[PDB]
């Protein structure tokens, strides 16, 4: 399917 990922802090 599809997804928007917003990554946690580096």
């Amino acid at each position, epitope marked *: *399917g*599809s*997804v*928007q*990922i*917003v*990554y*946690k*802090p580096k």
Partner: nanobody
Framework: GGVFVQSGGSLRLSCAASGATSTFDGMGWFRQAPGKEREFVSAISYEQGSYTYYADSVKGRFTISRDNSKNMVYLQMNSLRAEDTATYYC???????????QGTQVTVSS
């Protein structure tokens, strides 16, 4: 339309949090300011003491919390500044990363 806050003011956001599944172990927030990329804000685990992540831009000002009895997550936004102007989105988390498969617009004056 959206929320309007004076600089130095505060705001609390809330979102339903159904609870941990095999896919997700927490909930958090990201934001998108006009003409900018999505920015991580904060994420919290359903498990007490597992993660509590914050963007460096909000550390000390924002506090994420959860109430597993109420199936709710909260974001307390204190000492707001004009750079916090954005639309805020809640999303399920897996190890702190947010997965979005309905925002709150917030304007802060300086």
């Amino acid at each position: 339309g959206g929320v309007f806050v004076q600089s130095g003011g505060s705001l609390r956001l809330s979102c339903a949090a159904s609870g941990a599944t095999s896919t997700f172990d927490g909930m958090g927030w990201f934001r998108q300011a006009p003409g900018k990329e999505r920015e991580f804000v904060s994420a919290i685990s359903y498990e007490q003491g597992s993660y509590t992540y914050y963007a460096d831009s909000v550390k000390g000002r924002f506090t994420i919390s959860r109430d597993n009895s109420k199936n709710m997550v909260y974001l307390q936004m204190n000492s707001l500044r004009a750079e916090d102007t954005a639309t805020y989105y809640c999303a399920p988390a897996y190890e702190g990363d947010l997965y979005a498969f309905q925002g709150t617009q917030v304007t802060v004056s300086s």
